[PDB]
Amino acid sequence: VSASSRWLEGIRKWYYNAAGFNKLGLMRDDTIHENDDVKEAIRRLPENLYNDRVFRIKRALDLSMRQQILPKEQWTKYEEDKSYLEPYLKEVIRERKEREEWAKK
Amino acid sequence: GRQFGHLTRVRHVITYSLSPFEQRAFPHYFSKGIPNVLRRTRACILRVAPPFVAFYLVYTWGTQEFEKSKRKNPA
Amino acid sequence: APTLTARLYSLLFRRTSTFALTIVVGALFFERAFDQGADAIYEHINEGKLWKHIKHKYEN
Amino acid sequence: ATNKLCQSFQTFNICYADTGLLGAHFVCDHMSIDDMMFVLQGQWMRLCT
Amino acid sequence: MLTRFLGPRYRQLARNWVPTASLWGAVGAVGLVWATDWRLILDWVPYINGKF
Amino acid sequence: MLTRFLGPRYRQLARNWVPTASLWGAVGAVGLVWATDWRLILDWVPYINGKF
Amino acid sequence: SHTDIKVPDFSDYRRPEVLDSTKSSKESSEARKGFSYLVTATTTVGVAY
Amino acid sequence: AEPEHDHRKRMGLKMLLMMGLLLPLVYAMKRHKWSVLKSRKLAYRPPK
Amino acid sequence: TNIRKSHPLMKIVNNAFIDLPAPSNISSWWNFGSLLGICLILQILTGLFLAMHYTSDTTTAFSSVTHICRDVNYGWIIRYMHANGASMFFICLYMHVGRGLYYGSYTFLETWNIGVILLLTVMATAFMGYVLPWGQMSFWGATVITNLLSAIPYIGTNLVEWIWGGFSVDKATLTRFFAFHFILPFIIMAIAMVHLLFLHETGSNNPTGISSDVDKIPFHPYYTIKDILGALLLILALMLLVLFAPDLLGDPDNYTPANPLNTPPHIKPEWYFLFAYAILRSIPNKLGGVLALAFSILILALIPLLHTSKQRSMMFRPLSQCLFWALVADLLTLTWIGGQPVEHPYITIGQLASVLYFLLILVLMPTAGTIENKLLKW
Ligand code: HEM
Ligand code: HEM
Numbered sequence A: 001v002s003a004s005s006r007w008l009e010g011i012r013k014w015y016y017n018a019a020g021f022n023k024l025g026l027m028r029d030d031t032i033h034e035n036d037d038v039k040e041a042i043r044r045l046p047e048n049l050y051n052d053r054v055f056r057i058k059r060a061l062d063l064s065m066r067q068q069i070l071p072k073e074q075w076t077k078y079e080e081d082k083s084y085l086e087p088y089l090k091e092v093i094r095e096r097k098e099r100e101e102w103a104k105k
Numbered sequence B: 001g002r003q004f005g006h007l008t009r010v011r012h013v014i015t016y017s018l019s020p021f022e023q024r025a026f027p028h029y030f031s032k033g034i035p036n037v038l039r040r041t042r043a044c045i046l047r048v049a050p051p052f053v054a055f056y057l058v059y060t061w062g063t064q065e066f067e068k069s070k071r072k073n074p075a
Numbered sequence C: 001a002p003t004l005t006a007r008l009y010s011l012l013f014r015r016t017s018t019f020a021l022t023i024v025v026g027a028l029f030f031e032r033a034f035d036q037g038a039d040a041i042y043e044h045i046n047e048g049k050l051w052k053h054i055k056h057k058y059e060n
Numbered sequence D: 001a002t003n004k005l006c007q008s009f010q011t012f013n014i015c016y017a018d019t020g021l022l023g024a025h026f027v028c029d030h031m032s033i034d035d036m037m038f039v040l041q042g043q044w045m046r047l048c049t
Numbered sequence E, F: 001m002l003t004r005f006l007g008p009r010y011r012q013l014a015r016n017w018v019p020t021a022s023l024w025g026a027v028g029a030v031g032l033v034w035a036t037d038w039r040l041i042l043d044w045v046p047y048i049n050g051k052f
Numbered sequence G: 001s002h003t004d005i006k007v008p009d010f011s012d013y014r015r016p017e018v019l020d021s022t023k024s025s026k027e028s029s030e031a032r033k034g035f036s037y038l039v040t041a042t043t044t045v046g047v048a049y
Numbered sequence H: 001a002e003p004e005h006d007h008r009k010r011m012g013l014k015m016l017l018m019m020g021l022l023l024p025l026v027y028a029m030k031r032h033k034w035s036v037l038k039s040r041k042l043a044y045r046p047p048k
Numbered sequence I: 001t002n003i004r005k006s007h008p009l010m011k012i013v014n015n016a017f018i019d020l021p022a023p024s025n026i027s028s029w030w031n032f033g034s035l036l037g038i039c040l041i042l043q044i045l046t047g048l049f050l051a052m053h054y055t056s057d058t059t060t061a062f063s064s065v066t067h068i069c070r071d072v073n074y075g076w077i078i079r080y081m082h083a084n085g086a087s088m089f090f091i092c093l094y095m096h097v098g099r100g101l102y103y104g105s106y107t108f109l110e111t112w113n114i115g116v117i118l119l120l121t122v123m124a125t126a127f128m129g130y131v132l133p134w135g136q137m138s139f140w141g142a143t144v145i146t147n148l149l150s151a152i153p154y155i156g157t158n159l160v161e162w163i164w165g166g167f168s169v170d171k172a173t174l175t176r177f178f179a180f181h182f183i184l185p186f187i188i189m190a191i192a193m194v195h196l197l198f199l200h201e202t203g204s205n206n207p208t209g210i211s212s213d214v215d216k217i218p219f220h221p222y223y224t225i226k227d228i229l230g231a232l233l234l235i236l237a238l239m240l241l242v243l244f245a246p247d248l249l250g251d252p253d254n255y256t257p258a259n260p261l262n263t264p265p266h267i268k269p270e271w272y273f274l275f276a277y278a279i280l281r282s283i284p285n286k287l288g289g290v291l292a293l294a295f296s297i298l299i300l301a302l303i304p305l306l307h308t309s310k311q312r313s314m315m316f317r318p319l320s321q322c323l324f325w326a327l328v329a330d331l332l333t334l335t336w337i338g339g340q341p342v343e344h345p346y347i348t349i350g351q352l353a354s355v356l357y358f359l360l361i362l363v364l365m366p367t368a369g370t371i372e373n374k375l376l377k378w
């Protein structure tokens, strides 16, 4: 909670609220651009996390269609955002870099 | 291209729809639409306006300067 | 049934064939009344200036 | 039967006091729903006209 | 050649479908008169007559 | 940022494929000169020079 | 389970003629359809002109 | 320079009147069809 | 069963306009695709009816247009529909491009690059069209634009004289510009078909930039009726110009016949080229200004390679939003400077705006996308 850390976290929380995807009930990982690494990582997710991702995205598209947002009570709080997708994508990237490293030798 | 029935997998989602001959086309057009328009205006004014304000000021300054430069000075 | 729109539906809109016959006859009488009123407005707004408001002066 | 559009269908007329449900029900593969709906409604219109 | 269409069912179908084809013929006739401004027929219509 | 292509295999492949690339470049150059009738180069060729 | 299925109330969007759930909707259907088709017919008349 | 002046203004008047009729009716047809989608409701009921 | 689905010809229409899965939430900014096709068909029809009474002879080309606007029955309405339709065409083009830039649609590389080809061909078509009436601006536009090739070293003058068909702009230049302006729109239509061909492989993007396969709706009747409404609004915008201000977007000098001996003092291009005119003349150098001119358009082909953000659309990227609108205001600045004479202070303003355009496209936006990635911890 030192000098620069609380200032950095304050700017990150500011930017998080400014981005505004939380107003549609989305999480950060729901907004990532689907490339081959991300399609593979999404493929590896278990059933429950996949189904939650599907319903959150479907509800956000419905809101965007109606040009509405959720009530303020239901916004995604910055501290509760779960990076459910990060470890899978990290493993997929590590595997692809191993393949690329073998192709050089 | 792609076809319905082959897009993706979805489970445990229920959708309720109402016929168009059963409901209003303009149910809360002004009582709800105007607050939402003000919300969106407020939400985007700070992103859209300052560039064009800077353009307006450069336009007026450049036109005033060009007008004054065409008038001659004594001596 | 006593409603105006209800009788319009029962008589004219239920079948597509009479819905098309009602459309072409409506466009016929709408064309006649619309052109008549539009020209009467353009002529009232421009009272005098046009040639057909002054051609009587120059023709026996 | 010839085009394998469904595994089964049935028509029904369920009656109640001054109201009821008149229609049909069917069971089919996920890539055959459009054809079954099309032929069903076509037969309703054919009997209507 | 086309003898297969001679039967009771085909004449019940034609009797059922002659009013619709009659009305689409009236649609086409009125549409042609309207689109071409045929004075030969429109001179007889009451209010339309004043246009000419 | 195509840093994936820095290794022994790719320099070996480039060494293998250099002669064909050079020959295709020569084909392109000769074709251009022949098509444009570029006198600047063609005046030095012995038998061609007599056509001007 | 599914027995807790219940359509959410569409009371806000419904037309005035079908707000009350204790009356038949068969009498009002022709008026509603006639209104909508009158709108469509006027549009087509203008486009034809 | 502009002999079509008067005729163009008469046409402009007819165009304004026709547009003043046609725009809200076509808007109403659009809203009529889209109302099926704009008031739909979704619910998620996973097996626990 | 259904002949709409099985007939060899109708399957293309069904798989392109009826059963096409489309996102449920595409906004009004997705309407300009169909409006560009409406505009292209409008120009083909009006132009074809203008070619029935036009002669490309240098001694009669000017008079044939007056014959159209004076003696041909409703010739004036056809003439000014064709002229104002070209301006509406370029409005729709720039909105289509800006839409694709804002929402990250450029990640469809084949569709984007074919789009860039369509942009260049429509520009050449509209440039050649303006030469046909043979006014003052027609003549000096053909002179300047054809002379741009003279900057090419060692072959430029040959290319210029070959295109002119002589030592100066003359009858042969007008006759061939008429043939090109006639034939080039059909090539544009074919390339527009390939544009849609590559598009249909992937389907549309949407405002959120998130995949919409979980929520698709059929194209008919939802976007057929929404596109009809947008078309009716395009007709409204066109007829307001044609019937109340037919000369607002044109230049008065073109109503004077061509004169090779004198150039007007206030010569300026059509409004839809002024920004690039501003780019060219801000560089006091012939070859430098011509290269900057070409790169001001071709940089769009480089736009796909500079995307650094892990999100596709700018909806959730405030810094990118601000830089985008600074780019829109900068292009409005270049258009304004393009329409003003070459004097102090407009020269320095135009230079700073030209520098800011390439600085924004090349440097600032990728750095913003990287700062945004770091702020979200990925
Ligand atoms: C004659 C010129 C053009 C025509 C007729 C045309 C037509 C279309 C149409 C009908 C669509 C589908 C509907 C829509 O997305 O609005 C489309 C999509 C698209 N066009 Fe064009 N276009 C033209 C030029 C261009 C240009 C100049 C660009 C970019 C430099 C471009 C890039 C795109 C892209 C990226 C999409 C996909 C948009 C998305 O999926 O979200 N097009 N175009
Ligand atoms: C993308 C399609 C087209 C565009 C953007 C376009 C644009 C233009 C423009 C800007 C003018 C100048 C009008 C003026 O200043 O008076 C013009 C004139 C002309 N265009 Fe086109 N045009 C297109 C297609 C066509 C086609 C397909 C034809 C004939 C087959 C045609 C025939 C003519 C003729 C004959 C003129 C000279 C008459 C006049 O000046 O109004 N155009 N065109």
Ligand SMILES: Cc1c(-c2ccc(Cc3ccc(OC(F)(F)F)cc3)cc2)[nH]c2cc(Cl)ccc2c1=O
Residues within 6 Å of the ligand: I120, I121, I123, I124, I127, I137, I140, I141, I142, I144, I145, I267, I268, I269, I273, I276, I277, I280
């Ligand atoms: C630079 C310049 C232009 C100008 C002309 C065209 C463009 C855009 C353009 C560029 C290339 C092009 O050809 C291509 F499509 F590539 F084949 C077609 C159009 C941009 C500017 N037009 C002027 C017209 C007058 Cl009358 C005078 C002077 C100027 C002036 O100095």
